[PDB]
Amino acid sequence: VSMDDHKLSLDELHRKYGTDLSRGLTPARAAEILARDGPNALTPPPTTPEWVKFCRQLFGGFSMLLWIGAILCFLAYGIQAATEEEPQNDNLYLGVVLSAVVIITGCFSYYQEAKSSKIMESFKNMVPQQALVIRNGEKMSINAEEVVVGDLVEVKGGDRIPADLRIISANGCKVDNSSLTGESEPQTRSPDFTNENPLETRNIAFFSTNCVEGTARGIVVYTGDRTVMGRIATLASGLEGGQTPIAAEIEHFIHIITGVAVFLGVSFFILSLILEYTWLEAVIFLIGIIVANVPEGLLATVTVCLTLTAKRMARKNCLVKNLEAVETLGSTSTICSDKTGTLTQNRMTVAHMWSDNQIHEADTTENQSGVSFDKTSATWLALSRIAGLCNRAVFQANQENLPILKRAVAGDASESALLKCIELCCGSVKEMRERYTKIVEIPFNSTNKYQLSIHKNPNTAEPRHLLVMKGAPERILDRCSSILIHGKEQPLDEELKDAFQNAYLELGGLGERVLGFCHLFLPDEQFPEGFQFDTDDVNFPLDNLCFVGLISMIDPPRAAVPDAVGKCRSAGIKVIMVTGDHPITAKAIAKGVGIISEGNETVEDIAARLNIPVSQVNPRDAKACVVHGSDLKDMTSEQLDDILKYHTEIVFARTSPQQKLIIVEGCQRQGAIVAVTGDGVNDSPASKKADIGVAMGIAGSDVSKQAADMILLDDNFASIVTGVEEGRLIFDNLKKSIAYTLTSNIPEITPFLIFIIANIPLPLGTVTILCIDLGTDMVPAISLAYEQAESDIMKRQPRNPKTDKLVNEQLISMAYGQIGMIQALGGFFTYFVILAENGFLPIHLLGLRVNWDDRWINDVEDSYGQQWTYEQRKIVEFTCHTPFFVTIVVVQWADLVICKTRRNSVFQQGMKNKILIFGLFEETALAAFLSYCPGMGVALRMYPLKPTWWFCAFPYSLLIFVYDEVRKLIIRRRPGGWVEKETYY
Amino acid sequence: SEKKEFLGRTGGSWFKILLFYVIFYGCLAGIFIGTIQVMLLTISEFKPTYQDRVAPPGLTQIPQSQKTEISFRPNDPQSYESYVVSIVRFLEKYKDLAQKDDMIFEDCGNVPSELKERGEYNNERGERKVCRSRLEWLGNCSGLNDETYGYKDGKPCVIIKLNRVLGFKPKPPKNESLETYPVMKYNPYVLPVHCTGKRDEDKEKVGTMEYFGLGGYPGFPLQYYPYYGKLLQPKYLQPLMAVQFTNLTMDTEIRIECKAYGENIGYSEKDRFQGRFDVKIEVKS
Amino acid sequence: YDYETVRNGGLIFAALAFIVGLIILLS
Numbered sequence A: 001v002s003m004d005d006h007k008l009s010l011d012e013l014h015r016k017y018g019t020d021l022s023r024g025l026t027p028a029r030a031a032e033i034l035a036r037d038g039p040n041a042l043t044p045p046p047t048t049p050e051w052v053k054f055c056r057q058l059f060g061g062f063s064m065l066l067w068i069g070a071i072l073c074f075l076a077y078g079i080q081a082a083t084e085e086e087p088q089n090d091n092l093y094l095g096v097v098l099s100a101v102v103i104i105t106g107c108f109s110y111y112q113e114a115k116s117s118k119i120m121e122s123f124k125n126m127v128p129q130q131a132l133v134i135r136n137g138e139k140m141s142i143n144a145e146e147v148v149v150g151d152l153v154e155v156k157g158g159d160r161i162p163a164d165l166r167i168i169s170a171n172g173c174k175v176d177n178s179s180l181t182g183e184s185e186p187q188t189r190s191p192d193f194t195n196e197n198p199l200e201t202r203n204i205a206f207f208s209t210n211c212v213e214g215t216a217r218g219i220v221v222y223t224g225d226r227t228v229m230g231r232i233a234t235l236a237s238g239l240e241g242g243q244t245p246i247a248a249e250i251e252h253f254i255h256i257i258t259g260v261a262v263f264l265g266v267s268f269f270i271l272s273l274i275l276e277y278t279w280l281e282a283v284i285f286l287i288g289i290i291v292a293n294v295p296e297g298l299l300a301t302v303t304v305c306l307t308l309t310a311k312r313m314a315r316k317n318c319l320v321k322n323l324e325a326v327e328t329l330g331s332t333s334t335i336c337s338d339k340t341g342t343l344t345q346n347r348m349t350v351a352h353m354w355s356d357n358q359i360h361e362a363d364t365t366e367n368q369s370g371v372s373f374d375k376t377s378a379t380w381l382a383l384s385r386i387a388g389l390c391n392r393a394v395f396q397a398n399q400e401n402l403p404i405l406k407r408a409v410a411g412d413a414s415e416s417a418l419l420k421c422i423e424l425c426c427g428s429v430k431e432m433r434e435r436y437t438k439i440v441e442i443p444f445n446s447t448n449k450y451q452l453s454i455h456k457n458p459n460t461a462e463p464r465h466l467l468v469m470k471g472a473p474e475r476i477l478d479r480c481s482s483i484l485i486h487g488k489e490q491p492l493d494e495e496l497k498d499a500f501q502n503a504y505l506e507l508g509g510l511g512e513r514v515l516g517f518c519h520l521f522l523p524d525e526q527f528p529e530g531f532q533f534d535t536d537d538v539n540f541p542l543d544n545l546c547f548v549g550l551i552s553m554i555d556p557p558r559a560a561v562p563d564a565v566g567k568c569r570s571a572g573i574k575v576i577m578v579t580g581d582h583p584i585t586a587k588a589i590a591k592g593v594g595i596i597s598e599g600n601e602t603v604e605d606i607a608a609r610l611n612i613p614v615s616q617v618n619p620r621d622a623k624a625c626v627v628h629g630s631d632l633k634d635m636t637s638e639q640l641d642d643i644l645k646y647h648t649e650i651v652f653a654r655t656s657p658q659q660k661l662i663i664v665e666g667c668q669r670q671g672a673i674v675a676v677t678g679d680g681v682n683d684s685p686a687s688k689k690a691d692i693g694v695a696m697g698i699a700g701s702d703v704s705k706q707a708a709d710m711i712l713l714d715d716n717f718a719s720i721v722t723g724v725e726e727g728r729l730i731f732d733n734l735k736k737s738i739a740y741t742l743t744s745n746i747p748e749i750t751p752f753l754i755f756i757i758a759n760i761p762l763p764l765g766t767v768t769i770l771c772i773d774l775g776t777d778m779v780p781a782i783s784l785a786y787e788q789a790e791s792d793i794m795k796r797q798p799r800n801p802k803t804d805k806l807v808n809e810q811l812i813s814m815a816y817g818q819i820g821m822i823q824a825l826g827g828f829f830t831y832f833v834i835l836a837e838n839g840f841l842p843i844h845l846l847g848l849r850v851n852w853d854d855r856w857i858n859d860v861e862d863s864y865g866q867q868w869t870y871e872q873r874k875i876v877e878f879t880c881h882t883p884f885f886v887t888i889v890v891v892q893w894a895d896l897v898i899c900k901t902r903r904n905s906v907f908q909q910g911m912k913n914k915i916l917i918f919g920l921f922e923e924t925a926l927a928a929f930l931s932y933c934p935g936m937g938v939a940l941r942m943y944p945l946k947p948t949w950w951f952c953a954f955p956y957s958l959l960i961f962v963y964d965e966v967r968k969l970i971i972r973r974r975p976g977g978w979v980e981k982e983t984y985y
Numbered sequence B: 001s002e003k004k005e006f007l008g009r010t011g012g013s014w015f016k017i018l019l020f021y022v023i024f025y026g027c028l029a030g031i032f033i034g035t036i037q038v039m040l041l042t043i044s045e046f047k048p049t050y051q052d053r054v055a056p057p058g059l060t061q062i063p064q065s066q067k068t069e070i071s072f073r074p075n076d077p078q079s080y081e082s083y084v085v086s087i088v089r090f091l092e093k094y095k096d097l098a099q100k101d102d103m104i105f106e107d108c109g110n111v112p113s114e115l116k117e118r119g120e121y122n123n124e125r126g127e128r129k130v131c132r133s134r135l136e137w138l139g140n141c142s143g144l145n146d147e148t149y150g151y152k153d154g155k156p157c158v159i160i161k162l163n164r165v166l167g168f169k170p171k172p173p174k175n176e177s178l179e180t181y182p183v184m185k186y187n188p189y190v191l192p193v194h195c196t197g198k199r200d201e202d203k204e205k206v207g208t209m210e211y212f213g214l215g216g217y218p219g220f221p222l223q224y225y226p227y228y229g230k231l232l233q234p235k236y237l238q239p240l241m242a243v244q245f246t247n248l249t250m251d252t253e254i255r256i257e258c259k260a261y262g263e264n265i266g267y268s269e270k271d272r273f274q275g276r277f278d279v280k281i282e283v284k285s
Numbered sequence C: 001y002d003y004e005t006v007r008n009g010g011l012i013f014a015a016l017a018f019i020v021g022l023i024i025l026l027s
């Protein structure tokens, strides 16, 4: 169905789109087209589903079971009205309460959904994308929404293609189609058309794809809504999975809980049939048990956690795409960091140089006045010539009246620094671009590690084209066969290579990036003037070049970085630098920001100290280490495993992007969760494979900021730290609540089982059970979410998902075998005191149901020889049920402040949460209000309480309080742990 | 699958876990029994902590109710044995050989006496004296009543009882022509019981009014009460009354209500057993 | 036991507990 005009020639493209091959478009015209077609962002869907979506959430589980139970209650009440005459309210009330619970739950989940979606919507507009258009002959980095149809647009590697373009000029440009093809493989891009099909041809770039490598420039054939790709981004697109660790353990818990609640359910239904209860009562009992063992609250709780973390991330500017991933970030036991742009601020100005076996400097003040060595030397003229010609960046439009240091530049940090330094120290770079006409070009690739240009011979005595090339100083040193000395060539010596290395140490030691520079006055006889040049095929010799010299600029880390690394290494998170920059530079930066600490010598430092060859030094004797990319290339999986495992502080240097990838994968080969922080396009493969990816929103590329799970809109590295901290809290808070809810279960289930063992009068009722499970688990389980991380300071190092989850099998042992049991024996005690206080000694109480539950036998005798009627001893009964509710409410206090803190005693945590206190007080108020309102003895069978009955419960709750802090004090004193290994949440 | 040996099940000894649990649970049980025995402070063996819940006593019956109903035929001994064995079982404790001299029984008046209080609830005295009730009291209706027998010609006797609430003293109401018309009821020391059947608008008057007991008075004498508890007064015996319908129109069920009027006694709405005694009577052939 | 009295006490209590809840909640 797609149509196109790609077949149309560049001059027919000229006439059709009235633009310019290189001069770009008129600003006036660009505003006219902007006013004509409107912003080039796809008109969004509806919303799509509005607030009616809340209905589904109101319908859905876990409340679904509450809904089935409620409708089963109303059904039961209808059946009870039909059969026999029944004054009792029974269910009815029950189904009402259940429905109300569901509705309230829905309000919660919808509220937290509202906050979370407001945040996630603000995050989309916090950072707008941008496009590099060409207008008035000059380049502009304008907003991505302001690109018009038919203006020229450049798209270096690492950028998203801002609209659908017809490539009129490109070099080595491999774009990634990704979504349009479904293929991860990059596809080359040239001005020539190859297929009638617009999707497969190479002259057509399209929206929502990104240029992996090389450079290109094209006229915008399609803007905004009506782009070739613009149909699938809304007509079929959506959220595409899949799994999230914390959420996965969440669902696993849900399946487990469902399983136990239904097993107990049917089991207690057969017990009901053996108890000879009526079906009308047996189903209500079933509903009771199920609604009991199943935490409604886990869901709303989770939503709470998510929303909270979202607010907190909103406050420190770090965007997270996937909320759950924040937890993943906490679980990180190894951060892999790129150096330039990441640990550093990717802002640079040239400080030092090296030519003619001499160290020169460039003044950085104002000034710049950077020579300071010899403005007249010829070797500086060649150096400056390379630095200017080989540089691809230029100043942005309307920037000429500003100081060179202070004007806006379109290019990477290195080339920008060069640009400013030549434009200031020597002369106008643009003028020397125009002087030395660039005939053919090689794009810059990280993979390639170098960049070079071939320009004409404007000089009268250069009787041929001139090649220039800058890059990794070592590749340059390799490729050369001679060096310029005072303007006169001279082959490479041992002396020259030694001075090169010594100067590289001297300048790299200051943590300065060391760009190497060389050139080649090509042999005349070898080629004529109109010789065809080949970028795809290497027709041009890269060897035997003429070395010129070195240039270095100071690279300052961001302020927060050393502190961040400090916190993470304080966090038991291994910090590992992975850069393709200089081995010496990355070592220095590492020492600086604390990836490598003093006193931890590398093998080479040891070889220096001990005056012995590096190979003689025991590699295990060594703490830290730096790995050269070349060594990495020849690494077996096993040897990387070794380096990674046996060395504490690790810095990878000279690494290819795939080597970043393999590094991360080696960290994943250890079983460890890894984070990846970066900026560059070449970070993307590394930050993809990661368990959690982080990228600069400013300094980052479009590809790597796409790929990442977390974007720092403020470029603040420290945001990672709080990030992981949040992720602990989530993993921490959730677990806490879980603990609490389970402790509610045992004392709800036990009475029906003790019921079987001896004919002991009913200690609680179904209505009493739901009373507990609703008053005692709605508010509190949610309130747990609001607690801050105790100490928490983890380090204690992040726990393996394999070691312990959100639902530890150990958690259930002190949740059921410890707390639950106590709440239970408390309940049974209070019940025995009630029944004792009414003439029925506890010893007398077993064997009673035989006549107790018997309706027509009113001759029941107690220990004091009193004859009780059915309705009297039943009143007594419901007055034993009522406190069991109240009493567990009393004991649930303890559990709340116990689950409030996992680590340090509840005194070190503080009271903090108002929702927790709110939970205590409104739990108690619900108890009271349930027991003393009129008609409650009839409605929910809740007969009012004798004052003493409230006090009965206390001892046990105190046993809880004491025990768990005897516990927490044992954690405190010893980490060896006996219970740490048995009763840790 | 649970791997073995190298794992040794889910872990090797693994003894101190079981030990920490039998220790902690024995501790928690020590706290449970501890709390159970301190609350066994306790309550005086002489009285329940709270009588308020026993309320005014409900009105009980001896021919053991099935569903508060009685349906049977004369012809089958088995038809009535269901009520016979229960009436004989209950009245086994009332045998004249069971009531004996040499304590704790002492004869009390054939004529119904004054409120007899054995003393304080304290245990300064031993096993306190208990007035005994001979089977001869309930009777009349030509020849004999009890123990039972069950002839159709009318009905077999329906014996009626009152709950034995600890230390309860029965109060007969004073008046001048109460809502009830209890016939052979003397004003003091009486506990009135009278039977009316099936609502008010449709009395149907299907049952004739005849009752009998101590002094031939159709109610309870205040000479037995108050009870001093199964502890202070084991082998005590409770006052006994008998309700007998001479006519009961064959082959029909008919609800009848035995109210026990008084200030001390109270009717409950939802408890049909409290302060009154409802029963469905139906004899058939 | 008794009646009215503990019903009232419990009632005023529920009221105070609940007011406390709102008060702490609105802080």
Ligand SMILES: CC(C)CCC[C@@H](C)[C@H]1CC[C@H]2[C@@H]3CC=C4C[C@@H](O)CC[C@]4(C)[C@H]3CC[C@]12C
Pocket (backbone or CB within 6 Å): A833, A837, A948, A951, A952, A954, A955, B034, B035, B038, B039, B041
């Ligand atoms: C272990 C012992 C020695 C320490 C005492 C602390 C515990 C056992 C105390 C504190 C609160 C007390 C309870 C509070 C209220 C009542 C109701 C009362 O009508 C009977 C006693 C009873 C049930 C008490 C039993 C003993 C008790 C549970």
Ligand SMILES: CC(C)CCC[C@@H](C)[C@H]1CC[C@H]2[C@@H]3CC=C4C[C@@H](O)CC[C@]4(C)[C@H]3CC[C@]12C
Pocket (backbone or CB within 6 Å): A893, A894, A920, A921, A924, A947, A950, A951, C006, C009, C010, C013
């Ligand atoms: C924040 C929580 C954990 C603190 C616990 C202390 C409070 C909630 C406890 C301790 C004493 C208890 C009260 C004891 C006495 C009475 C008087 C009675 O007429 C109603 C019950 C009531 C009101 C109890 C309710 C709960 C109670 C007030």
Ligand SMILES: Nc1ncnc2c1ncn2[C@@H]1O[C@H](COP(=O)(O)OP(=O)(O)O)[C@@H](O)[C@H]1O
Pocket (backbone or CB within 6 Å): A339, A340, A412, A414, A415, A444, A445, A446, A447, A449, A450, A451, A470, A471, A472, A473, A513, A514, A515, A516, A579, A580, A581, A582, A655, A680, A682
């Ligand atoms: N514009 C450029 N042209 C040529 N070489 C460059 C350029 N920028 C950086 N280099 C060299 O490439 C090396 C590594 O490249 P890469 O891994 O892509 O990024 P970085 O070093 O900035 O982390 C650096 O050591 C640097 O000297």
Ligand code: ALF
Pocket (backbone or CB within 6 Å): A338, A339, A340, A341, A342, A578, A579, A580, A581, A680, A682, A683
């Ligand atoms: F320092 Al880098 F990619 F930015 F190796």
Ligand SMILES: [Mg+2]
Pocket (backbone or CB within 6 Å): A338, A339, A340, A341, A342, A678, A679, A680
């Ligand atoms: Mg970088």
Ligand code: NA
Pocket (backbone or CB within 6 Å): A291, A292, A293, A294, A295, A296, A773, A777
């Ligand atoms: Na539940």
Ligand code: NA
Pocket (backbone or CB within 6 Å): A740, A741, A742, A743, A744, A745, A823, A892, A895
């Ligand atoms: Na609990």
Ligand code: NA
Pocket (backbone or CB within 6 Å): A291, A292, A293, A294, A741, A744, A745, A748, A773, A777
């Ligand atoms: Na529960």
